[PDB]
Amino acid sequence: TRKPFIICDFDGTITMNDNIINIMKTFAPPEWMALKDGVLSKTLSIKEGVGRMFGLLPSSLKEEITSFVLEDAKIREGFREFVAFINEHEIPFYVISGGMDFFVYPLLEGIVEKDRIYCNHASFDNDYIHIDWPHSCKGTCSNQCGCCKPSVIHELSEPNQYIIMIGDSVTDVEAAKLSDLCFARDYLLNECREQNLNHLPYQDFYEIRKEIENVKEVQEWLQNK
Numbered sequence: 001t002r003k004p005f006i007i008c009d010f011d012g013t014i015t016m017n018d019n020i021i022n023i024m025k026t027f028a029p030p031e032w033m034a035l036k037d038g039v040l041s042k043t044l045s046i047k048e049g050v051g052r053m054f055g056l057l058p059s060s061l062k063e064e065i066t067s068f069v070l071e072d073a074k075i076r077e078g079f080r081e082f083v084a085f086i087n088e089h090e091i092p093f094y095v096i097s098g099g100m101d102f103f104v105y106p107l108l109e110g111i112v113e114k115d116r117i118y119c120n121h122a123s124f125d126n127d128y129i130h131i132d133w134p135h136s137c138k139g140t141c142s143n144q145c146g147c148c149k150p151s152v153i154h155e156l157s158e159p160n161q162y163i164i165m166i167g168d169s170v171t172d173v174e175a176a177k178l179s180d181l182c183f184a185r186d187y188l189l190n191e192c193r194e195q196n197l198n199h200l201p202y203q204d205f206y207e208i209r210k211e212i213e214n215v216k217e218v219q220e221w222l223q224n225k
């Protein structure tokens, strides 16, 4: 049998909204939209665009931003029960995200351990917010992703695993192409349908857990116990 291996995005997938976007709408000058549009058009890399977006913001905003995000962000229904199911079955599980640990960590506290969280780091030691990118592109990726999901997936997975990707962003199509099944919303769902990637839509993680359990290859794997 083939062991399941699950990777899951954070902003817009685990949370209802894109926390980077909401930070920018709330604190950034209008120029942030031009940077966003450059990332969308592929004029700017993710790393370059996101870096420049956070670099609009004075580090003196640390606590207001942190406070804003933790009260703004809402976790999608069923997520806790889903991680409990992962744990119950000892399924490899990783959150791989372009977000910043100053909000990803507190939002996942008591649910996901830090060795399962691959995200970027925002520093507040300079005049303007600075990003460190500890999981950047290696190997065959040279796309300046910032947090390189394909590179992390190749690093962590093993031969013959049944790779399940869960996401929402159109920029995670390369990760979805590596999956045997993609749970997709929003523009990622359109990309999976367009490129004929094996996929399923989802409203919440109750639905995700139910569907995962009844994937043939997952059932086979479980029924060795």
Ligand SMILES: [Mg+2]
Pocket: 009, 010, 011, 012, 013, 167, 168, 169
């Ligand atoms: Mg997302």
Ligand SMILES: [Zn+2]
Pocket: 136, 137, 138, 141, 142, 143, 144, 145, 146, 147, 148, 149, 150, 151
């Ligand atoms: Zn990359």
